[PDB]
Design a protein around this nucleic acid. Structure first.
Ligand SMILES: [Cl-]
Ligand SMILES: [Cl-]
Ligand SMILES: [Cl-]
Ligand SMILES: [Cl-]
Ligand SMILES: [Mg+2]
Ligand code: NA
Ligand code: NA
Ligand code: NA
Ligand code: NA
Ligand code: NA
Ligand code: NA
Ligand code: NA
Ligand code: NA
Lengths: 123, 123, 123, 123
RNA sequence: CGCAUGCG
RNA sequence: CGCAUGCG
């Protein structure tokens, strides 16, 4: 068994840079994983992908496609006070949110400002 | 149900320029699509990607990543007489081939000259 | 011996466009070069890079990599009133600041608004 | 102590992709290193850089600026049959050689084709 | 500004 | 085509 915090840190230590869309995806993956008791399945898939020589980024995409909790799942809403609260290497990946975004199509999360404005983070 | 020619024309209508590396990708997509009877699935993915705000170029890339026939597929080899047979706008995207290229990693096709020399087309 | 104004004019005469990130880099280079009495050394590096085939943009970058005053240097903070004060052609190169930015890693300057919000200019 | 083969492989293992300008720089560094008996210092410098959190690419550039054999050193000439013999991710880094290329200014090597054409590899 | 790698 | 990272 692995905790959410421990798994996030393992995943973060494989990712280039900081505050990228993949860093946000790690947080999303680990929260949904925790809530669905999928953390060990997720961890196993991550390790196996690395073992096969896949990039960490590739491994995270594959998790959203292969682990059941993410299949046909909507991105979580993340409430923020301002655009400045969005991770610092994600700003160019924001788009208006479509009617039915799916995590397995690259919609990581939906940021929601205090006036209710939303911005979708897309890989 | 959609013709390969018709789907090609739809795709081309969305693309900037003429004879670009993405026009070459359209042709590869339509050939492999026709052969696998996947043209309707391909047309659906193209439209779904455009609908969620993807550029036409990105929508084509999404097809290679999401439609089963392109999964792990090696690029076709296209035999040519000279480098002049390659559309001029594709020339900036030409590069030597790797050991085991995959369409879903950006390798559209491999051009091969009479003397066996090759030039890969990478988006 | 060369003045900061003369060097800036030489550099500008090489650059395309108006109000680009590279124009701001010139201003940063000439200021820190004036302060450190490095203008002749900067000038020599600029000319030496051009002579070996670097673009003017690349030659300005080579100065930040090669001239001692720019080594690990933190970028200057420029106080502004609105994001509209930042030249239009620079807008594409703006992003949030990292923990400890350095000129020789591409951080030209940091624009700061009255309320303390910041925008880093990254080449 | 370390051998030239063991050092190359250590360095290669840290580099992204294959056949890049940095892969060629590894071969150059270990060749001139071996010939000048600088392998242990080169290894020491590479490890310290990585320990500081520098990228392997950064570490290799620092070697060319810090290790005496590379200071003001001419790039080696590599005799090849045709452009196809150049490493597969170096083609876009080739340019005409200036009068006096230096490794510490990023001139990794000069390829000499059988037809007489010279092409310098520039980082 | 450009190259390389990763990802879509 | 775009984004991210690294390098010049
Ligand atoms: Cl906003
Ligand atoms: Cl449709
Ligand atoms: Cl403003
Ligand atoms: Cl290693
Ligand atoms: Mg983050
Ligand atoms: Na990181
Ligand atoms: Na067109
Ligand atoms: Na091959
Ligand atoms: Na590698
Ligand atoms: Na280059
Ligand atoms: Na990278
Ligand atoms: Na790329
Ligand atoms: Na970059």
């Amino acid at each position: 068994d692995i905790s959410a915090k421990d798994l996030r840190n393992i995943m973060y230590d494989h990712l280039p840079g900081f505050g990228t869309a993949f860093h946000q995806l790690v947080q999303v993956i680990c929260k949904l994983g925790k809530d669905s008791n999928s953390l060990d399945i997720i961890h196993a898939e991550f390790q196996a992908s690395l073992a096969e020589g896949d990039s960490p980024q590739c491994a995270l995409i594959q998790i959203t496609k292969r682990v059941p909790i993410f299949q046909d799942a909507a991105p979580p809403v993340i409430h923020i006070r301002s655009r400045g609260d969005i991770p610092r290497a994600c700003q160019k990946s924001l788009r208006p949110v479509p009617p039915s975004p799916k995590i397995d199509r690259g919609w990581v999360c939906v940021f929601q400002l205090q006036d209710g404005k939303t911005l979708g983070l897309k890989i």
